From a paper:
Structural and sequence analysis suggests this method of pore assembly may well occur throughout the tripartite α-PFT family.
The structure of AhlB was determined to 2.9 Å in space group C2 (Form 1), using Se-Methionine SAD and subsequently the resolution was extended to 2.5 Å, using data from a crystal in space group C2221 (Form 2). The decameric AhlB pore is constructed from five dimers of the Type1 and Type 2 conformations, with the Type 1 conformation an intermediate on the soluble to pore transition. Indeed, the transition to form AhlB Type 2 from AhlB Type I is an extension of the same hinge movement observed between the soluble and type I conformations. However, if a pore is made using the AhlB type 2 conformation alone with AhlC, no steric clashes occur, further indicating that the AhlB Type 2 conformation is likely to be that of the active pore structure. Unlike in ClyA where the α3 and α4 head inserts into just one leaflet, the equivalent hydrophobic head region of AhlB is of sufficient length to cross both membrane leaflets, indicating that AhlB may be the pore forming component of the system.
Author numbering:
A (entry chain F): 17 to 342
B (entry chain J): 264 to 359
C (entry chain I): 159 to 263
D (entry chain D): 159 to 201, 209 to 263
E (entry chain G): 264 to 339
F (entry chain I): 54 to 105
Write the structure that this text describes.
């Protein structure tokens, strides 16, 4: 995969993302603003690479490449046909071609400056989007862990209440019975079984007592627990969705880091072309304004340097080859 | 099992969409050959030759389109053996 | 700043843990108190009016307990929100401090 | 040291727990004494006397609990912070070490 | 699914726009070539080489990219 | 602080790195000249023009 396919890959990935809606999560209001702002910016940057910059680089190398593909040599000794007046013009042409082709290379590199900065800002925006989401998540797990213990402690109250209600019914069934023995014995011989009737009702009243109370306490203990685990499953959702979104943006930041490296490497290739053309321009200049063996030396060097230009040109062309897949 | 089947169906859908695309190219490029042959016929001398030459290129393009479809559509798919569950693994999948 | 935040988390969590404790102990006193109240009210028509000390203490329990359930709710609504503020503020701060150190590195 | 501190923090959580129970026990006795008092203010005063004894005790446990809590939270936060310091030290030495 | 498909449609607008514009750049260039030729700024022989260099370089990329794209869309 | 750091990084990337790539271009040209001498100076050539 070429340097241009790297950047395309990032562009086609970022363009397809969707603004997040965290409206059901007030804790994430701010993470929402930052994301949707980061993304909108990256979307513009991505469009401009596809609409403008990639076309300009490719165009620019095309021009340069067409010219040196013809002028793939420097005549370093007066060529069989020409005279010396029109040798020195041929050379002066090329010097001026390459002076023009040099500025274009330099101006291509300055465009690549903008592209590097654009990718880097995006990479940065995504680094920060991930960092803030992790903060929020780490916050929430603190809370979840407290909510957990909190729920366990209420389960005590509920167990108590259930225990109370069951001890209640037992006291009622048993109390009813003891009351019945007591009460039926007093009817047959008034007086004799008084502490039994008495104990019977003590148990009976106590029982419905615990049943009624226990159920009250249970209704509250359930209410309280339910609030707790709905607060808890809101955080679980909040964590999950902060995590998915976050791991998406870790991905996008790696796609953008990759593109940064690629655009840096374009920067490098163009810097060499610019500098190799510099040498050519030097060699031709001194070539033109010098004498005998000297002239020839410079112009041989210029020729050697044109082959180097050609090298540099294939390098950039390898860099800008292709149409990244899906 | 129905998870694996929906995956197989999703691949099927991709392959059928890709069929659709290739047939659309044949369709559109034949529209171009038709367009060239017409304008060429009703034209005369150098302009004729122009349209007709493109027509030639297009016909070259049409064979591409054909060799591409023919590639999508050749082959008899081999038997697929889904290793299914045995008893000792099923009795073991209950115990867990 | 870190110790202040850590201290408030300690307070807000101690406030909630005690709110719960109220709800727990509370319910116990309610139930407790109903057993005691039944026993006293019956030992009140057995001993002509001797044991009104216990009917009273019984009812007083249920009232306590009930106030303990009713209070522990107020406090659990007006705390859960404030605890998530404090943790998020704490995690924010850890992250930002680290970012500062990373910039220095 | 880290594993020992973890037990130490566990151990000290009992004190914080104990002081919260205290406070709520206090608070309960006050709701109760407050109710027993308004009672006696009907009928005759023997019970009003209990009522205030109850609220006085209540407040005692709240005031004592509150002081016991401040202390025990402090002694714990000292442990946490010592721990997080080691935790950070293990993290650094490990990363550098690797 | 709905939100993602409005986003996918939006992408399709931006790229349709860039393609309409591309055709515009072509028809306009071809027009300048026509003007220029009609006022003797160059000859068919000039055009002839510029068009010969194109086919062996720049056009061979477009034409390459065509069968590359037809390929991707056909899965081949 | 950070902004001044990114300022230092930017000076490296856009002023120094290009000067380093330029140096390499100068190595290329210097050796083009060194290897060009035997080409320009055939066997029966004088010390004087070797020196020139």
């Amino acid at each position: 995969a070429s340097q241009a396919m790297q950047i395309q890959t990032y562009c086609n990935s970022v363009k397809q993302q969707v603004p997040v809606d965290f409206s059901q999560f007030p804790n994430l209001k701010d993470n929402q603003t930052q994301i949707n702002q980061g993304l909108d910016l990256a979307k513009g940057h991505a469009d401009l690479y596809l609409n403008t910059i990639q076309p300009q680089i490719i165009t620019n190398i095309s021009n340069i490449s067409n010219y040196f593909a013809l002028q793939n040599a420097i005549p370093a000794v007066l060529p069989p046909g020409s005279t010396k007046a029109q040798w020195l013009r041929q050379l002066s042409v090329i010097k001026e071609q390459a002076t023009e082709y040099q500025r274009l290379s330099s101006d291509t590199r300055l465009v690549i400056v903008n592209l590097n900065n654009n990718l880097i800002t995006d990479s940065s925006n995504f680094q920060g989007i991930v960092v803030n989401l992790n903060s929020k998540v780490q916050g929430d797990n603190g809370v979840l862990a407290q909510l957990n213990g909190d729920i366990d402690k209420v389960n005590a109250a509920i167990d108590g209440a259930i225990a109370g209600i069951v001890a209640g019914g037992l006291l009622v069934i048993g109390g009813a019975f003891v009351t019945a023995i007591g009460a039926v014995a007093d009817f047959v011989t008034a007086g004799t079984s008084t502490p039994v009737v008495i104990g019977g009702v003590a148990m009976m009243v106590a029982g419905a007592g615990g049943i009624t109370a226990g159920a009250i306490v249970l209704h509250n203990s359930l209410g309280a627990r339910q609030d707790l685990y709905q607060k808890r499953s809101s955080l679980n959702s909040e964590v999950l969705i902060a995590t998915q979104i976050g791991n998406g943006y870790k991905g996008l930041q790696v796609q953008a880091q990759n593109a940064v490296t690629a655009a840096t490497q374009m920067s490098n290739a163009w810097d060499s072309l610019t500098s190799d053309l510099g040498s050519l321009i030097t060699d031709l200049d001194k070539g033109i304004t010098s004498g005998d063996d000297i002239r020839q030396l410079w112009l041989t060097a210029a020729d050697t340097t044109v082959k180097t230009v050609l090298t540099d040109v294939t390098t950039i062309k390898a860099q800008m080859a292709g149409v990244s897949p899906l | 099992g129905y998870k694996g089947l929906q995956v197989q169906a999703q691949n099927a859908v991709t392959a059928a969409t890709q069929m659709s695309n290739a047939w659309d190219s044949l369709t559109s490029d034949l529209g171009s050959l038709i367009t060239d042959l017409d304008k060429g016929i009703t034209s005369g001398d150098d302009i004729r030759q122009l349209w007709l030459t493109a027509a030639d290129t297009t016909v070259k393009t049409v064979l591409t389109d054909v060799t591409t479809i023919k590639a999508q559509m050749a082959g008899v798919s081999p038997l697929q053996v889904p290793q299914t569950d045995t008893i000792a693994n099923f009795v073991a999948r209950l115990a867990a």
